[PDB]
Amino acid sequence: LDVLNKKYSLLDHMQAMRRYLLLGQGDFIRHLMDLLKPELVRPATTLYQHNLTGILETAV
Amino acid sequence: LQQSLELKRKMLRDKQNKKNSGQHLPIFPAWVYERPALIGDFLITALPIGTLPLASQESAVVEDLLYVLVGVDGRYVSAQPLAGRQSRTFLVDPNLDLSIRELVHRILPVAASYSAVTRFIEEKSSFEYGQVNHALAAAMRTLVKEHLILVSQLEQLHRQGLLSLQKLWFYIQPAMRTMDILASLATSVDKGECLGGSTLSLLHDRSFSYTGDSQAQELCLYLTKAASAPYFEVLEKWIYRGIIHDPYSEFMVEEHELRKERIQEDYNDKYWDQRYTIVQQQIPSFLQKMADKILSTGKYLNVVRECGHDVTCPVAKEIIYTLKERAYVEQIEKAFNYASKVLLDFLMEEKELVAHLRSIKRYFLMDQGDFFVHFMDLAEEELRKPVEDITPPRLEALLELALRMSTANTDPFKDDLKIDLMPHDLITQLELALSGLEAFSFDYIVKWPLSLIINRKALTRYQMLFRHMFYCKHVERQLCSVWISNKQWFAGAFTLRQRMLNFVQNIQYYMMFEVMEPTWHILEKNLKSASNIDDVLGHHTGFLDTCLKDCMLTNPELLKVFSKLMSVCVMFTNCMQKFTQSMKLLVSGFEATINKFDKNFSAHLLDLLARLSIYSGMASVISRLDFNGFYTERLERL
Amino acid sequence: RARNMKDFENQITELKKENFNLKLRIYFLEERMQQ
Amino acid sequence: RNMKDFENQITELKKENFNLKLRIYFLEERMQQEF
């Protein structure tokens, strides 16, 4: 239970999962879906993750 | 038995060819194997009174047993010649009364158990069998004494009349067990032919097997505590120093005489994995967890000996052996974490691997472009001649001249740059006259400290990377020349120049800002974070492969139309400079070139986009192309 | 079929780059036995 | 490009590596058998 949090991380990653994966971080998604609003409608059908990651970093 | 001749005679050569023959391994004279007076059960009247007094017959077979138990004839009981099979048989007198005869047969297996270990101790002393098999045969002598001592006192008792065959059957019982625990170990080394460090595996397994048995387990723990001492005595030398004193060849590591005059500077192939090699039969079955650490430790210290003089061990306390405990595991850890760090420091403090790498990047990866706007401007007119028409010392002196006015003239290892030539040209990847630009390369000399990093398997790729990069540098210079030589100032040639230029100048801008400088910074942090030279060699190799694969190269067909783009570009510049020389220093022959090259180039450039699109990062290639003002969108897509 | 797509694009690259790391040894090793 | 090819690019590239070492098994042991 120490090395899961002092070499690996667990309780901080649970906090991060509630933030992002469970949408609880009211800052990030609240403007991701502003910048990504064009891409949420636009069907760029094989614009895979490597073209979809740069929008993540500018949203941050 | 009589196979022992051949069995030693093959072993002789197995030791003696692998152990370099400046002095022979010793051997005992021919009497030591001949003479029966060393063995147990020495070798080439009864008188029964109608077998009348029964108490007498007991004393008689006790009396004889007290000889037979130490390997001597009786005169009722005896021993048979047939030591040719792996265990002895005893005659008993066929008139000896039943029940007595059965009790005799019940105790006799300790005699044969003794017999087989007298011969084991005798034979496996000999200098063929490596150091371990000796120290095993040595430790066992103690228990022959104890057996002999026992049998003495019982005969002394028998002379008083105070000992009976039923009492002998009681007193013998610890011997019955403790000889069989040994005889069943001897035959396992005979048949196993563990005639090297591998016999420790047989002892460690047998030791763990008796974990239930205490009174038998200590006898086995004694033997492995003893017989392992010679083996560990070598292992200490190998882990604490770059040193290998094996007088046969039985240790887990072995050495080969690899870096002889055939290869100074490692000339493309297979250094480390031949120089020192783990002999997989000869690991004692309780070291595998860090057998690679063992090999790596001594490899590293032996390089420090040869390059950096020190043979100073870290601690060099004894790797004593005991079951279950982890002292030797941690000692080999400490020795590894020492030896690795020391060789790293020797690679990284002076002659320092980084500084060498920094000079390489300025020349092959070309980040000191200052260098070449001289060098190739000097060397170009010499390089317009074909191959075998070139003066190499003239070229070498032109190097070491651009390298004078250039900022490059500040580096301590700049003198290691050599001009070499590749034949085969960029056609290399699976006529002779087109040369110069097609055939030129740099090279670096290396030295035994750094050759284990920067040898030909690396530098051949640094050349290939340089070759591709120097090529585009050349044609781009020819292309921009067509502006200054133009100053009728015909517009079609001028716009077609701009388009060809923004192709070749942008493949230029990619490779070094998208591949080289990024992956190089990543390399720099990787080397700075590496703990030993196996890690560093990996980081360097992976960096180099990354930079190679992402700069068009390693495409299954050279992304072939790229070679064509380069070819039409050069010929376009060649004809344009010839025409503009001619037109003022005809246009009907020229417009043909303008038309056919706008056509050919459009075809080859849109082919390039079509051929790359399979890979869809790598998508950056279109990003300075499809940026503004498109001519790529002359293609309605796919 | 449980590919995360990232572990495919980090795998085709590794297969090709070791493919050519092998391939380069073919070209030298054959001439070093015939040239 | 399609997801139904990702598995197949992996399949063909690793068997390409298999054929690419299938021969230099021979080409390396030839470099002992030469002598």
mmCIF file of C-alpha atoms in Angstrom, chain B residues 270 614-615, chain D residues 1 23 28:
data_model
loop_
_atom_site.group_PDB
_atom_site.id
_atom_site.type_symbol
_atom_site.label_atom_id
_atom_site.label_comp_id
_atom_site.label_asym_id
_atom_site.label_seq_id
_atom_site.Cartn_x
_atom_site.Cartn_y
_atom_site.Cartn_z
ATOM 1 C CA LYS B 270 30.007 -9.431 -33.454
ATOM 2 C CA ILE B 614 -0.560 4.733 -47.223
ATOM 3 C CA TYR B 615 1.052 5.835 -43.914
ATOM 4 C CA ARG D 1 -6.732 2.143 -44.450
ATOM 5 C CA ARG D 23 17.863 -17.164 -44.691
ATOM 6 C CA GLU D 28 25.508 -16.955 -40.629
#
